[PDB]
Amino acid sequence: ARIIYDRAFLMACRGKHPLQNRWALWFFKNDKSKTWQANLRLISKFDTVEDFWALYNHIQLSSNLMPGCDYSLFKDGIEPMWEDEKNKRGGRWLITLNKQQRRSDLNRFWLETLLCLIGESFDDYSDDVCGAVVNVRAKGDKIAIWTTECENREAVTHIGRVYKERLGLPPKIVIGYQSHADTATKSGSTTKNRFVV
Amino acid sequence: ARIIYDRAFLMACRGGGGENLYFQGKHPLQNRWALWFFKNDKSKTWQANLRLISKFDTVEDFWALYNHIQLSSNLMPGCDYSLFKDGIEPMWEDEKNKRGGRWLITLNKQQRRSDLNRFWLETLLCLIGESFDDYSDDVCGAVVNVRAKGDKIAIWTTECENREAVTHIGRVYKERLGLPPKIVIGYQSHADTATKSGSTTKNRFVV
Ligand SMILES: C[C@@H](O)c1ccc(-c2ccccc2F)cc1
Ligand SMILES: C[C@H](O)c1ccc(-c2ccccc2F)cc1
């Protein structure tokens, strides 16, 4: 049966409990002097609650929020690039933060996102999750959960609705899901949402 | 009490026939086990080349995974497959491996065709069936290194200094492999394997 942990349980393990999946933490800086492949660093992998927290504390203590960086947590064997076989037919639920929310909501929202991933918070639809990405940017931070198949409406919408609930966002505040094939095309200031919740 | 299966029993479960009525029809294993894959691609970090394939905790789920990997795959040199108890990384620096070692068998090039598949399977059955009595708790896992010069199969154990456990595991393993008494197997501590000190690594024990 699926290994599922709620928020209370994961927090109680913080200072081994196996995860349903093994996960890989990646770092990317968009340094145009280097190829995208050189810019992409695997930091670490883990598959227990306790090893997640040890890595979290180490990255949080030893940390940077340099704009232009990205951190990504993805299931083992999935590259954090939309061209991966497990991402190319998929998309993302995107949370856009305003500049003030860098100080108030970024750390909390990112952590809540990470807990939804490792705790398998979306029931059978947790299998559709590929990973999550935070883009640290001067103009506004972005957090997203990447899923494998943009045509799996039931899976995608369940993920969005639960994610929204776990973030504690007001029902007024709507989140969009965008297919990666649409995000990849620059067609103006906005990318169309395939779904909203 | 420990869940122990002999070879005959495990082989009799090979077959998807099971209905698994009530989710209670499969034979539980004493431990949950994780199958890992590693390619030593020097363009990537060691972390990037180590992949978790799957985990299982019944006899029937072992066989479904075995059949799938056996049908869908062959053996590239430079690859390693490892089966380890859940929560032990197949790296000697893991807390459960750093004070331990391995019982090693090395197969020559011809034995890729004749003995590799059989020996690897017999190794896997010793692990999942808890074939070493209370000393099965000292087992961490097993590793096959597929190599052009000669393949290696090993059972990794947790603690060097547990002489009685280590030697019992070795004797039983050698018996389960059906090796001639002439053919000796060595146990090497991982701290000694890690240091390259010449053509050989010292054996702490031999059976
Ligand atoms: C932005 C900075 O505070 C940060 C970024 C990533 C992690 C992290 C650590 C372990 C596993 C997944 C993660 F995303 C932690 C902290
Ligand atoms: C490809 C090679 O012949 C191979 C490698 C690993 C297994 C395996 C299957 C199930 C559980 C653990 C395993 F190591 C079987 C075959």
Q: In Å, how far from its chain's centre is CA A110?
A: 8
Structural domains counted in chain B: 1
Domain assignment present for B105? yes
Provide the CATH number for the domain around residue A113.
Answer: 3.30.760.10
Q: Residues B147, B152, B158, CA angle at the centre, nearest 5°? A: 135
CA distances from B143 to A61, A194, B166 (A): 36, 46, 17
Quick check: CB of A73 below 6 Å from ligand 1? yes
Radius of gyration, CA atoms only, chain A: 16
Q: Residues A79, A85, A91, CA angle at the centre, nearest 5°? A: 80
Domain assignment present for B20? no
- Are B102 and B190 contacting, i.e. CB atoms less than 8 angstroms apart? yes
Task: Report the candidate in A169, A23, A153 with the shortest Cα–Cα distance to residue A94.
Answer: A169
Quick check: CB of A104 below 6 Å from ligand 1? no
The three-state secondary structure class of A36 is: helix
Domain assignment present for A1? no
Q: What is the dihedral of CA B201, B187, B70, B50, to 10 degrees?
A: -60
Domain assignment present for B173? yes
Domain assignment present for A2? no
With an 8 Å Cβ cutoff, is A42 touching chain B? yes
Half-sphere exposure for B197 (CA within 13 Å, toward CB): 8
Under 8 Å CB-to-CB from A122, ≥6 apart: which residues? A116, A128, A129, A155, A158, A159, A162, A163
Looking up tokens 């050989």 gives B200
Q: What does the DSSP 8-state code read for residue A190? A: -
Domain assignment present for B13? no
- Domain range for A137 is 7-196
Atom number in ligand 2 closest to CA B70? 16
d(CA A98, CA A124): 32
Domain assignment present for B125? yes
Domain assignment present for A26? yes
Is B51's CB within 8 Å of A24's CB?
no
The answer on whether A75 is annotated among ligand-binding residues is no
Distance from CA of A54 to the nearest CA of B (A): 15
State which H helix or E strand residue A69 sits in: strand A69-75
Q: What does the DSSP 8-state code read for residue A129? A: E
d(CA A20, CA A126): 10
- B156 forms beta bridges with B102, B141
d(CA B170, CA B167): 5
With an 8 Å Cβ cutoff, is B68 touching chain A? no
Q: Give the experimental resolution in Å.
A: 1.9
User: Pairing state of beta strands A69-75 and A18-29?
Assistant: antiparallel
User: Pairing state of beta strands B101-107 and B186-189?
Assistant: antiparallel
